[PDB]
Amino acid sequence: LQKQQEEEELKRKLKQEEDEKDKRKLIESGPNLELHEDKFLLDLSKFKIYYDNNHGYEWWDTAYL
Amino acid sequence: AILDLAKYKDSKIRVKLMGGKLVIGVLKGYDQLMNLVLDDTVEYMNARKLGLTVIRGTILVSLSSA
Amino acid sequence: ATLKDYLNKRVVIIKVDGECLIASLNGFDKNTNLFITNVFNRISKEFICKAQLLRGSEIALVGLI
Amino acid sequence: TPLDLLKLNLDERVYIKLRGARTLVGTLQAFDSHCNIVLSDAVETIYQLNNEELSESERRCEMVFIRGDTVTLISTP
Amino acid sequence: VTTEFLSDIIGKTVNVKLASGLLYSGRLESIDGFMNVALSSATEHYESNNNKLLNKFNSDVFLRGTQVMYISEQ
Amino acid sequence: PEILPLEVIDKTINQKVLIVLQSNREFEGTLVGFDDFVNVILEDAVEWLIDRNEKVMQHHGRMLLSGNNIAILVPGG
Amino acid sequence: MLFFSFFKTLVDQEVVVELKNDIEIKGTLQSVDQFLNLKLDNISCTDEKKYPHLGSVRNIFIRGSTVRYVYLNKNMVDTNLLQDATRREVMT
Amino acid sequence: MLPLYLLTNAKGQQMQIELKNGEIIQGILTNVDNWMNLTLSNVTEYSEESAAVKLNEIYIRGTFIKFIKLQDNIIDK
């Protein structure tokens, strides 16, 4: 009855807690947000459309060729 | 509802009311709201004889047999 | 406003008739119906019940001791 | 409608009878349908009968909310 | 049917008893489904009109519905 | 073959009814009408207070008796 | 719903509460609900006689049905706000 | 857990009800509804706690109950 409903909510909360522990483990194996490590990660799209848009050497010298 | 009043039709019941009234009568009718129809109604206050009375269910506090 | 912070804690209860209780609050609903354990009479210090259910109509005050 | 004719005297002085021989006089700040009230600058009169004799007590308050369920009557003084 | 009554006696002179015994005689300004009542030229008496006049409100009188035991015409 | 309380009150219309509050007070009169909440209209009510019982008043015309306080109805007084 | 709204603006403000059974209690309004129940933090004694049998208790829950009065300060409340809001409220 | 859930599963137990009038009702719970109306079998009602009528079945309106003493067995049962 009511104790079964409280056992349901406690089941959801506990499952979220174990999910949080697995989240911390996954973060240990992998990009921690507090350390700002998101900024170490490379992007291929940006540098590829950049490099292509540059005819192939930066934006500096594109006025020569 | 949790009380089946049908098994009490044509029996003598004891009904305590809000404000300290007692009524013993014979159960003739009932509704889902616990309104009763008592016959040979005697209201205990020590003794008073009303006849065919309608008890309001909103003020009913307790109900036993007699 | 909620009695959530009081769960499982000891409480003082003042009834509307000015009577006083001491108890562990275990359950409560929206109408202030309480489920209590190890209840005592504040004034009397007399043990009332190991478990008891108390209507909200009766309650005037619940305090967190 | 009687609850609208009460808005009529918002910010006007009112007289309020309560359960227990209590009386309030205040300026009407707020009410609802429950009769719940707020009064400002109010004085509350309590008529008590102790030792078989009648005394009336007083209590002043600059702002008070009144649970509406004890309210019996509202008029003007 | 009770509503037909409420609109049938508006403007008439009524007695309104409350729980306490107190009785109010006035002219019915307005009424609401919660039994709330508005009266004008009201007097209060205890139990009967023939008893001592306790108050005469020159102002309009709002009587709370939860408290009214009847409204009756004369 | 069920007997419904409100049908019993419906039958006592235009008859004499006793109405007993949850307090001592009683009303005897001619049952004019009633609603679903058991509010009640009486015609020429005798209002009583009960134990030597003093008869409070003799009403003339029509009374709306709040069904909020009604404990018992007796048909034909 | 109006007095719920009123009592919300009073949070963090010291109030005195008078209960029907002649109990008077000073406290900081921490919380309010739909029934006008009240939670008072840092409980204190206004009257010697009326005040009940407490002590360590500093946090209380008061049942709204049992209050008669809530005593306020005129500076806790904009009157014109109250008035125009009551005027707006519908009662039918 | 909630008082009502607690009651719904105490079905078949013994319990003691104190009513608002002082009457005490010892009996075995046979049914509860969402408004805490009860029906009990094997009943003994007392005029007050000082104590004696034995009744086969009793129905109790929930609005009339001050409190309900449960059997210590309750938590595990």
mmCIF file with all atom_site columns, C-alpha atoms in Angstrom, chain E residues 1-2 47-48 68-74, chain F residues 34-35 56 59-66:
data_model
loop_
_atom_site.group_PDB
_atom_site.id
_atom_site.type_symbol
_atom_site.label_atom_id
_atom_site.label_alt_id
_atom_site.label_comp_id
_atom_site.label_asym_id
_atom_site.label_entity_id
_atom_site.label_seq_id
_atom_site.pdbx_PDB_ins_code
_atom_site.Cartn_x
_atom_site.Cartn_y
_atom_site.Cartn_z
_atom_site.occupancy
_atom_site.B_iso_or_equiv
_atom_site.pdbx_formal_charge
_atom_site.auth_seq_id
_atom_site.auth_comp_id
_atom_site.auth_asym_id
_atom_site.auth_atom_id
_atom_site.pdbx_PDB_model_num
ATOM 1  C CA . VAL E 1 1  ? -36.708 25.519 -4.999 1.00 0.00 ? 1  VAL E CA 1
ATOM 2  C CA . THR E 1 2  ? -34.701 26.942 -2.107 1.00 0.00 ? 2  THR E CA 1
ATOM 3  C CA . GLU E 1 47 ? -33.817 34.492 20.572 1.00 0.00 ? 47 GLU E CA 1
ATOM 4  C CA . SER E 1 48 ? -36.946 36.662 20.129 1.00 0.00 ? 48 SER E CA 1
ATOM 5  C CA . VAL E 1 68 ? -26.976 31.171 9.844  1.00 0.00 ? 68 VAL E CA 1
ATOM 6  C CA . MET E 1 69 ? -29.614 28.832 11.173 1.00 0.00 ? 69 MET E CA 1
ATOM 7  C CA . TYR E 1 70 ? -32.563 30.258 9.288  1.00 0.00 ? 70 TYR E CA 1
ATOM 8  C CA . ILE E 1 71 ? -33.856 33.146 7.287  1.00 0.00 ? 71 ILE E CA 1
ATOM 9  C CA . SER E 1 72 ? -37.551 33.798 7.868  1.00 0.00 ? 72 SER E CA 1
ATOM 10 C CA . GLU E 1 73 ? -40.049 36.395 6.607  1.00 0.00 ? 73 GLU E CA 1
ATOM 11 C CA . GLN E 1 74 ? -42.672 38.183 8.738  1.00 0.00 ? 74 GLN E CA 1
ATOM 12 C CA . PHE F 2 34 ? -36.402 21.076 0.291  1.00 0.00 ? 34 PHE F CA 1
ATOM 13 C CA . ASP F 2 35 ? -33.220 20.772 -1.801 1.00 0.00 ? 35 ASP F CA 1
ATOM 14 C CA . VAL F 2 56 ? -39.339 30.533 21.167 1.00 0.00 ? 56 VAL F CA 1
ATOM 15 C CA . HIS F 2 59 ? -43.234 32.234 12.474 1.00 0.00 ? 59 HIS F CA 1
ATOM 16 C CA . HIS F 2 60 ? -45.606 33.550 9.807  1.00 0.00 ? 60 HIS F CA 1
ATOM 17 C CA . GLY F 2 61 ? -44.864 33.097 6.125  1.00 0.00 ? 61 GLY F CA 1
ATOM 18 C CA . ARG F 2 62 ? -41.840 31.100 4.998  1.00 0.00 ? 62 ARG F CA 1
ATOM 19 C CA . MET F 2 63 ? -38.642 29.987 6.647  1.00 0.00 ? 63 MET F CA 1
ATOM 20 C CA . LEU F 2 64 ? -35.512 28.637 5.025  1.00 0.00 ? 64 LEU F CA 1
ATOM 21 C CA . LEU F 2 65 ? -33.954 26.310 7.604  1.00 0.00 ? 65 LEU F CA 1
ATOM 22 C CA . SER F 2 66 ? -30.273 25.515 6.914  1.00 0.00 ? 66 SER F CA 1
#
